[PDB]
Structure formats: C-alpha cells, structure tokens
Amino acid sequence: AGNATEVPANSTVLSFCAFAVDAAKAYKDYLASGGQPITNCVKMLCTHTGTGQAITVTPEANMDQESFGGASCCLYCRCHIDHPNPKGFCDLKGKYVQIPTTCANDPVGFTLKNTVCTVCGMWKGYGCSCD
C-alpha cells in the first residue's frame, strides 16, 4: 500500500539528516566525508530563455541555469523535518528554483548555502546585479 517517493541511493543521507540536530550542518559534513549529493530531484525541461530569477512561479532558467521543482531542492522538504523560518513554512515548495549549471549536480546543497537577493531576485554571487 502506498507509493514510493525515494530511491536507495538517498537512504543513508536522508536518514542521517532526518535525525540530525543541525540538518544543514549534517548535509555539509556528509558531503565533506565523501557522500554523494541527494539525487532524485525534480529537474525541468524548459526553453532556457527565462528571466534567471532564483525562485519563480514557472520555470525561468536562463542559459546559465537549470530549473528544478522547489520542494525537491529543499533539504527540509526532502527529509520531512522542520523548516528554519519563524513560522516553519518553506520558501521553495510551490515554486521553481533556478540553479547555476555549475552547481546543478547538488541543488540541495546549493540552496542550503546560498541566499536570494531581495532587491533584484537573483542569487547573491550567481546573478545578483546589486553590489
């Protein structure tokens, strides 16, 4: 009964992060000890002619990005654990997230370590036009 969501290659990392006091730190440490990034994310086909904004209603990848389903790039969604916002709600689930192609092998790690600029809507260090 029921429908699987996960694949065996993610069992170790998801179990570790689901039990961790500090899930973001656990994922960072897991990778530093040689673990493989979380796979089985929701990667989109698109036209690569989008705005390049980080978090969007529909896929918005430019030629330097890939578009993913937002929940699938969120460690807290993937592990089914509490989110760190004040009210415990997610800013990725229900949106698409654009990830630089150079980091698309590890979308979850990318979102954990990076910040969206609230002025221009692009990732700090990966498109933000503000300086």
Partner 1 sequence: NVTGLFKDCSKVITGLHPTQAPTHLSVDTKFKTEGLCVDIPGIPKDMTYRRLISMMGFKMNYQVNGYPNMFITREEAIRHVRAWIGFDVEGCHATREAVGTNLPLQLGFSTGVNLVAVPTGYVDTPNNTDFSRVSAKPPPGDQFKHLIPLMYKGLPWNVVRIKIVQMLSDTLKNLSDRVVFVLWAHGFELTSMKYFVKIGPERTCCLCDRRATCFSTASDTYACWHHSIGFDYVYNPFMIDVQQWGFTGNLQSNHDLYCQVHGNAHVASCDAIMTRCLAVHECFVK
Q: Write down the least CB distance from residue 92 to partner 1, Å.
A: 9
For the segment 16-75, give every residue that binds Zn ion (CB under 5 A).
74
Handedness of CA 120, 124, 125, 130 (dihedral sign): positive
For the segment 53-112, give every residue that binds partner 1 (CB under 8 A).
58-59, 69-72, 76-78, 80-83, 88-90, 93-96
Could you give the C-alpha distances from 42 to 65, 97, 107, in angstroms and in order?
A: 14, 10, 10
The amino acid that residue 22 corresponds to is D
CA angle 107, 124, 13 (to 5 degrees): 25
Q: Which residue has the tokens 């990667």?
A: 43
For the segment 64-123, give every residue that binds Zn ion (CB under 5 A).
74, 76-77, 90, 93, 117, 119-120
Q: Which residues bind partner 1 (CB under 8 A)?
A: 1-8, 10-16, 18-22, 25-26, 29-30, 32-33, 35, 40-46, 58-59, 69-72, 76-78, 80-83, 88-90, 93-96
